[PDB]
Every structure is written in C-alpha cells, then in structure tokens.
C-alpha cells in the first residue's frame, strides 16, 4: 500500500512551471505600462483588476500602484474594484 | 501626387469606416486583446532587433 | 473611443513631465512644443500635435496657460515649501486646505519638513 | 453483504467528474482479504 | 525575430530597398512592411527546409545574454561539420532560443 | 543545397510582398525590379554562384589595466554564425553549448547544421 | 594538520546608485538576466572570482582562496565601475565567511558514543553520510565525513577555522578506528 | 425481517458515498491550483472503518 517516493510527482511538475516564469516580475517603465492600460481602458471604461493582472507580467502590487495613480478604484456594485480613468 | 492625394481621400472613406470603428469601440474585444498581446510582443521583438543590431 | 492621436496618453506623459520639473524645483513656463521636446514626442506629426491642442489640452478641467507658455495646472499655488508658519498664522485659512499629495514632493521630503515643523510651533495632524 | 452487496454498492455509484482539463475516476471490483492485524 | 536581417541575404535586400526610395520608385513604411514579411519568411524557411547532423568544439572569450539572445566571441576555435573542418581564430556567435 | 534554400525563400517572399506592393499602389514592374536589384548584389559579391546567378577608498585607478580594448571583438568581416540555442551550460569555467539550425560562414565557406555541440574553457 | 582556506565571501559598498543594464552591455564577461536573479554576475580570470554586483550599490565577491585575493579582486571590480563612468568608492571591505578543508589522515567512526549522547552532534544517514558538529564556544559548523576529510564553515576570521579543528581533534582521536 | 447483511448494507451504502464525496472535495481543491491529485492519497481510509 505505501511506497517510498522522494519528491511527490505533482510537486515536481509545479516546480518546472514556477521556475520557468519566476513568480511575477520587477518594477519599471510605468509610463509604458500606462499606455497599454489605456488601450485596455478604451475597450472597457471599467476594467477588472484580475484581467489587468493577466495583461501585465509585472507583480499585482506594482500594477495596483499604477492603477491607483490613473484612477480611484470603483466597486460599481459588482465588486472586483473595477478601475476607471479619473474625470480630472 | 494628386493620385496620391485621392488615394488618401479613399483612405478618408476608410476613416469614415473608422468612425464606424469609433462607434464599434465582444468579438471586437477579443481582437483588441489580441492587439494588446501583439504590442507586448512588439516591445519584446524591438528589444530582440536591438540585440541583432549589436550582432550587426 | 472617440478620436485618439498617435500613442495613447501622450498628454498624460506631457502632464507628468510638467509635474516632474516642478517637484525637482526647476520651474519654468513651457509652451506645448517645449513640453513635447522634453517628452521627445515633439515629432508626433502636425495633425497629432493639433489634436493635442484642440482636444487633449481642452479636456483637462484645471489646465492653465498664462499666454504663449503653459503653466502648472494641478496646483495653482507654487510649491514654495516656505512660510508654513505664516500659513498657520491665518487659522481661518488653516494652511489653505493643504493636501498630503501636494506635500512630500513640493521641494523636499515631508519627513525632513516634519522634523523642522516639530521644532517650530507648527503641529501636523492627519485625519 | 461481502460476497455480493458490497461489489454492487461500489460498482454502481455516481462517476467522479472533476474539471480546462477534467478528471474521471471509475471503481472496479472490490477485493476483501482475510482478517489481518 | 528581425534576427536574420544583417546577413548577406537580408542586407542585399535592405540596400535594394534604400535605393528604390532614393530614386522615388518605392517609399519607406511600405519598406518596413516588406521587412516584416521577410522576418516571417526567413524564420519559416529555416525551421522547415534543410537539416544536417554534425559534431564540434571551441575556446571562449566574451559572452552576453539579453532579450533571451546569446552573443559569444570565441578565439583560436575549430568547427568541423561532417567531413569538412574549419580553422577560425575569431568567431562571433549570435543565438536565439 | 544552400542556393536552393535562398531561391526558395526569395520566391516565397516575392510572392507575399507582391500583395503588399499592389495594395500600397505599386506596378508589378517595380516588384520585378526589386528581384533584379536583389540578384545583382549577390552576383557582384561573388560569394557563391546559384540558379539566379546563372541568368585609499577613492584612488581606484592607480594600478589600472585588468580589462582590454573592446575593439578586439568586432572586425565586421569576422566569421558570423547565426543559430538557435537549446541549452547553454557552465560549471566553473567549463562551458558546453547545445545549438541548432545554424548557418556558419567560416574560412570564407558557408556551412549549415541542424545541431551543433561544442566545448570551451573560459 | 593545518586547514587550508577554500572560499572567501565579502561585501563592499560602492557608495552610489548603479544602472545595471548599462553595466551589462559595456563591461566584458558580465551576464545580467533579470528573471532568474536581480544582480549582474561579473567574472575575472586573473584571480578566480565570481562577483554579484547589486543594483543599489552593494557588491558581494566570491571564489577567492585567501584574504588578500578577495580584497584585490574587489578593488578590480570597483576599478571597472570607475572605467564605465559610474562614480566608484570602496566601503567596508568586510569578510563574511571563509570555508576551510583539511584531512585528519585517519578513518573516523563517532557512532559508539553518539547513541549515548549527541548534544552538539546531529547525524541522519539518509539526509547525508557526514555528521554536523555545530560548536558553540568558537561558532563554526564542522562536518566529519567517514573517510576523514573535515570541512569547517562559517568562520568570519582565519583564526577560528584553525582553533575549531584543534578543539575537535581530541574527540576524533578518541574514536579513531 | 431485516438480518445482519441487509442492515450493514444500509450503513455501508451511505459511508462509501461519503468516501466518494470526500474524494471529490480533496481532489477538487488540488485540481484548482492545476496541481493534479493522487487518488491513493485522496481516499480517506477511515471513513468506512
């Protein structure tokens, strides 16, 4: 019933993926990221934070700071803290 | 250059089609998401071309 | 998406560049061409430059231009970083509605100003 | 209960579906071995 | 990858393109579109057309890795492919993933 | 087997830029002029014939040196190899290269490989 | 027996903000891949040494086999930064550790009294054959391989490596096969 | 008249369903990370015993 495996097979598979894309990324070129975010904002005035996280390789915390600068998060009553361009 | 200008005027008819595209901006969303992916790919490839220029 | 000229948010970069020099402490009135030269977007094309003046500059609610050269628009008052004691002296003004976003960048880090303020009669409380 | 009903209870039970990829589990024939401690 | 533009093939192309612009035959922008077409075409042809199995060796100098592209420079090297052998004392190697 | 690939690629590219040319308002004679210009250059360089050719904490600089002029790396005539890397490996100063799809212009001659394996000490 | 130093790891502050991308493109033999790690790895041939030069101006140097070699290599790395054009300074060249290796020259088995007491010794055969004898009075970790090679690690100064080996020498002499 | 077998079946029937339910919950969580599960570690041996 009980074998002697060293590294569980499931654990070894995630490792290669976790290595391939080292977690998230670094913190730079915010203006270049802003132009890409603006193209996404044109597609939808309010954009889900999780969808933006998929769009940007950079870490969520760094992305949130850029998103807060462009506009205040608005819940919209649907949750997800949708991000919209500031009226100013 | 006047033929060039009238070709530009048909491009302006294409831009009236682009005003329809301004009304356009679902399937259009998937295509523009593909365009965002393409813009990231283009930044990466421009950096690759900069590397090729060092090779040049 | 209405009408957009060349790269998206060229105006936003122009606003950021205008903000950067003021925070740096080098303040000069800048024409739209001068800000475009600083951003390196000056060769954006004649139609795109005209679009920025006609729509992007007009869109901003607080945009201020003295005459030939545009002037800082987010804060009408210059970021002097001085006479804070004088601002306190008028209690009714109460520092002219001073904002933390305006501070921590006027010409020095807020923490250095806070150490000077603590020694002075001025007291800082943040609701 | 051992000889017949137990095989029938495991053999006949809802198939396990769990999904992107999905995962299927199917039960076969129950074996019972003499008491052992 | 705009990798193969500075090759005999790719440069002869660019030179040809530059001249047409100068003689008002073609214009730029269209020329960029042509280069883009070239990238797809050279890449496609390389991966599926001809293959050779070989064996080899070298001696290192500089290396660089950026944009997932390795650029080496070997000195006093020797690269033999199948029957043919080469005697090189200065070789630059650019390699994409 | 190399002039063949080049013809192959030139043909394929010409047929694909044909569409671009006509759509950008271009006579097909200028497309055939491009082909001719392209062929001419290679036939003039005479690198090969072909089927189209048939037609104190501060004074840090006192000792100096330790590094060398970076010009020793660039000649512009240096044997240039373009290839695809599978795995590059380095233990201590020992490097091993696992390369593929490469075109090697060396000793003046042109070579190709689907795979190349090398060894070098740094 | 006298232990021989095999590795010196040192940290030296260059004193100013450095742009990593510019350093990688110019300085020869300098790999800077952001995804795997955040620092430029620079290697020099004359004294073997691999150095990670960090972005905020802190440099860690490794691979040197003596006290003088580590300082000389670090000075050369600082000189290269000055040659690039970044302002370069040398600050607190402080050794962090010196791994040393030696052979007692006799076979060693410590198992007989390990069973009775193992306060300073921890040994698991599956994890590794070597037994780790973390020692408190001179802070070092000494690992005994059954063959007799002892590797001492963690010593911030040259004297500690020698003192620990002299201290552990009687225990091994007692358990000599 | 119910006997020993037809009463143990009523007890066994539901408990086997409980092992199957549990297998679903455990593997479900793992499938979500995309990790992939192992049914040998998914069966909780004590639900029937």
Swiss-Prot record, chain A:
Compartment(s) of residence: Nucleus
Source superkingdom: Eukaryota
Residues reported to bind DNA: 77, 79
Coiled-coil positions: none
Subunit structure: Heterodimer of an alpha and a beta subunit. Interacts with HTATSF1 and GPBP1. Interacts with URI1. Interacts with GTF2B (via N-terminus); this interaction is inhibited in presence of GTF2F1.
Similarity annotation: Belongs to the TFIIF beta subunit family.
Function: TFIIF is a general transcription initiation factor that binds to RNA polymerase II and helps to recruit it to the initiation complex in collaboration with TFIIB.
Name used for this protein in its record: General transcription factor IIF subunit 2
Source species: Homo sapiens (Human)
From Swiss-Prot, chain B:
Coiled-coil stretches: none
Cellular location(s): Nucleus
Pathology linked to this chain's protein: Intellectual developmental disorder, autosomal dominant 73: An autosomal dominant disorder characterized by intellectual disability ranging from mild to severe, developmental delay, speech delay, behavioral abnormalities, and non-specific dysmorphic facial features.
Subunit structure: Component of the TFIID basal transcription factor complex, composed of TATA-box-binding protein TBP, and a number of TBP-associated factors (TAFs), including TAF1, TAF2, TAF3, TAF4, TAF5, TAF6, TAF7, TAF8, TAF9, TAF10, TAF11, TAF12 and TAF13. Component of the TFTC-HAT complex, at least composed of TAF5L, TAF6L, TADA3L, SUPT3H, TAF2, TAF4, TAF5, GCN5L2/GCN5, TAF10, TAF12 and TRRAP. (Microbial infection) Interacts with SV40 Large T antigen.
Protein task: The TFIID basal transcription factor complex plays a major role in the initiation of RNA polymerase II (Pol II)-dependent transcription. TFIID recognizes and binds promoters with or without a TATA box via its subunit TBP, a TATA-box-binding protein, and promotes assembly of the pre-initiation complex (PIC). The TFIID complex consists of TBP and TBP-associated factors (TAFs), including TAF1, TAF2, TAF3, TAF4, TAF5, TAF6, TAF7, TAF8, TAF9, TAF10, TAF11, TAF12 and TAF13.
Entry's family note: Belongs to the TAF4 family.
Chain's gene name: TAF4
Range within the parent protein: 942 to 1011 of 1085
Curated annotation (Swiss-Prot), chain C:
DNA-binding region residue numbers: 1-79
Residues of the whole record sequence present: 68 to 194 of 291
Location of the protein in the cell: Nucleus
Assigned protein family: Belongs to the TFIIE beta subunit family.
Chain positions found as N6-acetyllysine: 7
Name of this protein: Transcription initiation factor IIE subunit beta
Gene: GTF2E2
Role description: Recruits TFIIH to the initiation complex and stimulates the RNA polymerase II C-terminal domain kinase and DNA-dependent ATPase activities of TFIIH. Both TFIIH and TFIIE are required for promoter clearance by RNA polymerase.
Subunit structure: Tetramer of two alpha and two beta chains. Interacts with FACT subunit SUPT16H. Interacts with ATF7IP. Interacts with SND1. Part of TBP-based Pol II pre-initiation complex (PIC), in which Pol II core assembles with general transcription factors and other specific initiation factors including GTF2E1, GTF2E2, GTF2F1, GTF2F2, TCEA1, ERCC2, ERCC3, GTF2H2, GTF2H3, GTF2H4, GTF2H5, GTF2A1, GTF2A2, GTF2B and TBP; this large multi-subunit PIC complex mediates DNA unwinding and targets Pol II core to the transcription start site where the first phosphodiester bond forms.
Organism ancestry: Eukaryota, Metazoa, Chordata, Craniata, Vertebrata
Residue ranges of coiled coil: none
From Swiss-Prot, chain G:
Organ and tissue specificity: Widely expressed, with levels highest in the testis and ovary.
Residue windows of the Sequence repeats: 5-81, 95-172
Subcellular location: Nucleus
Origin: domain of life: Eukaryota
Key words of the record: Disease variant, DNA-binding, Host-virus interaction, Neurodegeneration, Nucleus, Repeat, Spinocerebellar ataxia, Transcription, Transcription regulation
Residue sites binding DNA per the record: 7, 43, 58, 97, 134
GO molecular function: aryl hydrocarbon receptor binding; core promoter sequence-specific DNA binding; DNA-binding transcription factor binding; enzyme binding; RNA polymerase I core promoter sequence-specific DNA binding; RNA polymerase II cis-regulatory region sequence-specific DNA binding; RNA polymerase II core promoter sequence-specific DNA binding; RNA polymerase II general transcription initiation factor activity
One GO biological process term: mRNA transcription by RNA polymerase II
CC per GO annotation: chromatin; cytosol; euchromatin; female germ cell nucleus; female pronucleus; male germ cell nucleus; male pronucleus; nucleoplasm
Family: Belongs to the TBP family.
Name of this protein: TATA-box-binding protein
UniProt organism field: Homo sapiens (Human)
Full protein segment contained here: 161 to 337 of 339
């Amino acid at each position: 019933t009980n074998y002697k495996p060293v590294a569980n097979h499931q654990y070894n598979i995630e490792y290669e993926r976790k290595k391939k894309e080292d977690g998230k990324r670094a913190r730079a070129d915010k203006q270049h990221v802003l132009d890409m975010l603006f193209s996404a904002f044109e597609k939808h005035q309010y954009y889900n934070l999780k969808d933006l996280v998929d769009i940007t390789k950079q870490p969520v915390v760094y992305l949130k700071e850029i998103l807060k600068e462009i506009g205040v998060q608005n819940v919209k009553g649907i949750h997800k803290n949708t991000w919209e361009l500031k009226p100013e | 250059a006047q033929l060039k200008f009238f070709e530009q005027l048909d491009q302006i008819e294409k831009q009236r089609k682009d005003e329809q595209e301004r009304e356009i901006l679902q399937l259009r969303l998937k295509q523009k998401a593909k365009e965002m992916q393409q813009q990231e790919l283009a930044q990466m490839r421009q950096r690759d071309a900069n590397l090729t220029a060092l090779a040049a | 998406s209405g009408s957009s000229g060349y790269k998206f948010g060229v105006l936003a970069k122009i606003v950021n560049y205008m903000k950067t020099r003021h925070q740096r402490g080098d303040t000069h009135p800048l024409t739209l061409d001068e800000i475009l030269d600083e951003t390196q977007h000056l060769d954006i094309g004649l139609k795109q430059k005209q679009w920025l003046m006609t729509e992007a500059l007009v869109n901003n609610p607080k945009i201020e231009v003295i005459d030939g050269k545009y002037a800082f628009k987010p804060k009408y008052n210059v970021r002097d970083k001085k006479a804070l004691l004088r601002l306190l002296d008028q209690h009714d003004q109460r520092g002219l509605g001073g904002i933390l976003l305006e501070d921590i960048e006027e010409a020095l880090p807020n923490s250095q100003k806070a150490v000077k303020a603590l020694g002075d009669q001025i007291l800082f409380v943040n609701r | 209960f051992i000889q017949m009903s137990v095989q029938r209870i495991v053999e006949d039970a809802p198939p396990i579906d769990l999904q992107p990829p999905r995962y299927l589990l199917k039960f076969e024939q129950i074996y019972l071995s003499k008491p052992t401690h | 990858y705009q990798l193969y533009r500075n090759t005999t093939l790719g440069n002869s192309l660019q030179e040809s393109l530059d001249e047409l612009i100068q003689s008002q035959q073609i214009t730029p922008q269209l020329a960029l579109q042509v280069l883009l077409q070239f990238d797809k075409a050279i890449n496609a042809a390389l991966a599926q057309r001809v293959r050779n199995r070989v064996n080899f060796r070298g001696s290192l100098n500089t290396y660089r890795f950026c944009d997932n592209v390795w650029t080496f420079v070997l000195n006093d090297v020797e690269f033999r492919e199948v029957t043919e052998l080469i005697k090189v004392d200065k070789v630059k190697i650019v390699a994409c993933d | 087997t190399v002039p063949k690939l080049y013809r192959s690629v030139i043909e394929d590219v010409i047929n694909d830029v044909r569409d671009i040319f006509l759509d950008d308002g271009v006579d097909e004679q200028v497309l055939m002029e491009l082909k001719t210009l392209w062929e001419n250059k290679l036939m003039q360089s005479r690198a090969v014939d072909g089927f189209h050719s048939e037609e104190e904490e501060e004074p840090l600089n006192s000792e100096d040196d330790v590094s060398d002029e970076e010009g020793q790396e660039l000649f512009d005539t240096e044997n240039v190899v373009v290839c695809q890397y599978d795995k590059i490996h380095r233990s201590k100063n020992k490097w091993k290269f696992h390369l593929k799809d490469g075109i090697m212009n060396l000793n003046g001659r042109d070579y190709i490989f689907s795979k190349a394996i090398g060894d070098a000490e740094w | 027996i006298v232990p021989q130093l095999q590795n010196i790891v040192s940290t030296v502050n260059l004193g100013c903000k450095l742009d990593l991308k510019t350093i990688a493109l110019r300085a020869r033999n300098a790999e800077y891949n952001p995804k795997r790690f955040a620092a430029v790895i620079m290697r020099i041939r004359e004294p073997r040494t691999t150095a990670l030069i960090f972005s905020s101006g802190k440099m860690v140097c490794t691979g040197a086999k003596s006290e003088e070699q580590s300082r000389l290599a670090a000075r050369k790395y600082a000189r290269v930064v000055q040659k690039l054009g970044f302002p370069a300074k040398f600050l607190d060249f402080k050794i962090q550790n010196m791994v040393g290796s030696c052979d007692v020259k006799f076979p060693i088995r410590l198992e007989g009294l390990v069973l009775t007491h193992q306060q300073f010794s921890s040994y698991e055969p599956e994890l590794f054959p070597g037994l780790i004898y973390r020692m408190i009075k001179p802070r070092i970790v000494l690992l005994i391989f059954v063959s007799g090679k002892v590797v001492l690690t963690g010593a911030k100064v040259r004297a500690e490596i020698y003192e620990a080996f002299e201290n552990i020498y009687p225990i091994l002499k007692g358990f000599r096969k | 008249l119910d006997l020993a077998g037809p009463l143990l079946a009523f007890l066994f029937r539901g408990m086997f369903k409980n092992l199957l339910k549990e297998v679903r919950i455990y593997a479900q969580k793992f499938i979500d990370r995309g990790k992939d599960f192992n049914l040998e570690l998914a069966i909780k041996t004590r639900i029937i015993s």
